[PDB]
Amino acid sequence: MNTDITASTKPEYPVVDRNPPFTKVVGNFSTLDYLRFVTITGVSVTVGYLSGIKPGIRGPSMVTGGLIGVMGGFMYAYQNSAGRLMGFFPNDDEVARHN
């Protein structure tokens, strides 16, 4: 099946690669992306614990919040890393690394 990665709006920053692989994008995770993931997961776990007290399922509520937060934070970190690596975001550090 044919797939085209071209976006409607042109990137405003130099493009390291148009279609970076999943492993490369994951390996591009800087400390800021890890902070994003950690903050989102912690917010989700705290919300789950604080909301699951009344029903009585604190462990299950934290587990569900943890899965939701892990998914959301990983999606956000991957989004930021890919946007930087395709030149959509201010990717000064990996542009310098590529150069």
Binding site: L32, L35, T39, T46, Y49, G59, M62
Partner: peptide
Amino acid sequence: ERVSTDKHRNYAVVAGTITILGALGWYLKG
């Protein structure tokens, strides 16, 4: 005698401290 015996509450406190540290680091690095 001087220990919190609730595992779930302890994990929640750890997650909250981790959240605060992550938010502070995000603010400082942003």
